[PDB]
Subunit: 296 residues, 4 copies
């Protein structure tokens, strides 16, 4: 019912999406948008079958998995809940959407097990969030972050120094898993289904599978709202007012709660590290359809 009021006519709605997508082209030239509604209707326009690495787009997914498997109380002994590297007053990374927090979050998953298993455990949730659609792995990107990710090594050693990891966790193992998860590949199409799972309270809308808890989803959407677009997060919360997560790949994972998930891809980044076209497209779509979280 709520969905029906927000999008009465799907074909008409996709027509407007296409028009905005087109306008935004007035900005390689990779440009794609896919969406998946909470009742499983789909639309892609442009370059939506090209694989690309999740990179930071994975941060809310791993956080949601940690909450789903361990609960809020425990997770947030190790990572904070608000916008900010550095550490906060309690001596922990500010939130799960900044690198230091995402690294700590990564360390929390299946602490009793090895590298291969941790990865496979996360991957099983990601597969289900995507309704078993396209999910790959870029060894090129993985090896590149391993060899050149000095910023993350610096953060890792700092977290270790400040005692920010759970007992018995090897810092280097946690970094290795974090780099692996950043190297998972999706397309706009599969990514949109993941975002739709978050839009749909943690149930994958193309399979009906329960993937994440309501608590995990609520927490994740809250932190995406406030921390999901790096230095542009405040502007985005004000003008667009929806949970989103950006990445250096030029991806934007956007959630419209109880309506749809979307994944946009356009590699060229603005000064704040967010897709120039993706961001502009979100603003135009939300203004036109009154999807802002505080639209009446």
């Amino acid at each position: 019912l709520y969905f029906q009021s927000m999008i009465p006519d799907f074909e008409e709605f996709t027509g407007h999406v296409d028009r905005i997508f087109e306008d935004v082209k007035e900005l390689p030239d990779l440009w794609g948008v896919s969406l998946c509604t909470v009742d499983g209707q789909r639309h892609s326009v442009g370059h939506t079958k090209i694989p690309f690495c999740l990179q930071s787009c994975v941060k809310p997914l791993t956080y949601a998995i940690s909450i789903s498997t361990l609960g809020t109380d425990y997770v947030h002994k190790f990572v904070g809940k608000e916008p900010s590297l550095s550490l906060n007053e309690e001596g922990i990374p500010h939130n799960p959407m900044v690198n230091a927090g995402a690294i700590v979050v990564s360390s929390l998953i299946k602490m009793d097990c090895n590298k291969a298993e941790k990865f496979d455990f996360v991957l099983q949730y990601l597969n289900k969030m995507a309704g078993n659609e396209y999910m790959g792995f870029s060894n090129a990107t993985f090896q590149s972050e391993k060899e050149t990710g000095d910023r993350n090594y610096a953060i890792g050693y700092y977290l270790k120094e400040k005692k920010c990891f759970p007992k018995g966790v090897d810092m280097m193992a946690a970094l290795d898993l974090y780099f692996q998860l950043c190297s998972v590949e999706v397309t706009c199409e599969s990514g949109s289904v993941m975002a739709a799972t978050l839009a749909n309270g943690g149930i994958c809308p193309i399979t009906g599978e329960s993937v994440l808890s309501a608590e995990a989803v609520r927490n994740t959407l809250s932190l995406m709202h406030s921390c999901g677009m790096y230095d542009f997060s405040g502007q985005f919360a004000f003008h667009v007012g929806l949970p989103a997560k950006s990445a250096v790949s030029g991806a934007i994972l956007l959630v419209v709660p109880n309506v749809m998930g979307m994944m946009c891809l356009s590699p060229p980044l603005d000064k704040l590290g967010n897709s120039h076209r993706g961001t502009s497209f979100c603003q135009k779509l939300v203004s036109l359809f009154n999807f802002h979280n505080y639209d009446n």
Copy 2:
């Protein structure tokens, strides 16, 4: 329809409100700011909650007809008036749109947002710039009256004179804003402070405050009068900034656990908006360390978590 799903049964809902109100009485911690024992506003046991739904249903429990000064609760109201009369583009040349950091100016040389004192002082200055002191006040008071559906609205001259004589923090901010050139042309800093102190001294009750909060919950239309008070744009902006900046240093925790637009004040008030459902005003003077009502905050957390009112609840 949407309201019906969020609150299927009003009477049953008010029954839960009453019970939580009662449970929260067990909480006695916190310190009252600017305690004057003769004054009802300083009573640590003052405790009241009122609400007004977007379709005009009402419920009060406890001390809901005791007047108290809006103080910081006026910040989002004056902001909403400025946007409604001048538009986003113009207002936000003079004030920012985001949280500051647990005060200063931002990268563009302007106060971080309308919910911190420096931003609220600038926002005060923007209203009816071509007119005099009396008229600015009356123009704001007319919007406030209408937001409250013409229910109780007073003025505390004692509070006004007290802030004038001892509000050193705000004078420091005022001179700093002047030094950094943060005010519009033709504005006298001292006049803008004077107006800000006046607006902070406007009095409401839980009941009249709840209606102001309901006007925000209802897209800018006062639900007990049908009047179009604020533009939709004004309300949307206001609710966004209340969500992220409305509870001072507790704003992050509140956004995470409660997930609603709220504004706290040193009076121990909490103006809470549940969009498309209701406005609520809670009052309990004893403050926790971050300056927010110990009981009010606890009550909001319990009510919102029981009823799934968090903005991102499924």
Copy 3:
């Protein structure tokens, strides 16, 4: 004896001073340098009889007077001792050379008395530091700081809010005195004698009068060394290595301990608010004569 080794031949020394003064002209066009040795020898070149307001150059003088009359222990309950507005860990202005500290310092002087008397009490020390040479007052500058000094009013109200003043002190009275003292006028010639008093352990070298205590002078020279040139203080300490104080008037009060005091005037300021020519002249003079505090 020590002076004799540092400057064996005064006439030869002044000849080099003149040559540097001249070189620096390759930079109104007000430009003057005066010096006064600790044994009372004098040299001026350029515009050394033009009065100008001490402004910030007064900050170390008022601080020295406070120490001389009240002692270190007491003064430094209210003001800190190191480079940094804001307040420090103990809730007090960082040092006497920043505005907030200079304002608090001003408040400490003759607390039991009125405006006129406070001023006259400070003025009696300043007169004696200058060996009774030129000392005036600019009402233009005083009224201008009163009407336009919003930064200082902001600081004043902040100090009052944070309870940084001694008991019973009216903040506005303290600001008024601080603005008055900033408006005291000297020439390069009279100013050089003040600086020579500091170079000579607190005895005015043209009169033999004991003006300030050894403790006051030592403290003052220490803080001038580290805090006396605003954001350029670290560079200056490293390359020049002498106690100096700059002001917005384009003045530089320079002390060469046990050798001489100097006052330079050149109104055009660099980006950090210090006289472009004055600063350059200090660097060249010190490199040539090996006057750096850590020169062997």
Copy 4:
């Protein structure tokens, strides 16, 4: 002549040194860092002071022949070597010249100064860039030997291996410097860390350390050998930065009350320079809250104030 005025009578001077050394034994507060009870360096009662005048007179009292690792005391020595071999202009493209703030990079994107770990790591990297690990070490060790007039100089492999295995703070700094591109061309970050950890593990005694400090007091000429070890420019820079950055967060207090170039270390050492008079090395392991020797600092304050050695004493 200048020396004669500062210390008119050597024997009388050493007598006062001895008495202050004795008085300071009453101070037992402080905490020993990285306490290993088998190791002499961890003994809270380890207490020694040696000095060497610029004309080569010597005095030791207490535990002055116990080796200990230079740790941070090596920072100003490696810096002085870099300036002496490469010059100010070149070195200070890679490291700043001033105190940081009670860690990060400065406005120009470089470590704040050579006395903080990040600056000392970069300074390490600058030395003999065209050569290998063994040679860099030996080249620095040769200057250190000469600064110490060929007196005691050792190496603790236990300390070196310990920092390699558990120095997480320094690895974090190292990767950050690499990320921000703070090293010269051709330098491997890990090699520079390894060298820095090696130099920190070089051992001296109070006696040999005092001579190194005397070389700095004497314009770069080792006073017990007459050898020209460091350039005048190197020494002047080094003493300036020790004055302002040498005692971590206590540097301001120390500059104000003591007014001399000094460098503290986590070992409880204090290398103190009295220019044109003497070098001194004090050792007492228990540290105050800011990481400086509780007894050493107190002893320096008492000695300097009694003898008027403050740089701005008249």
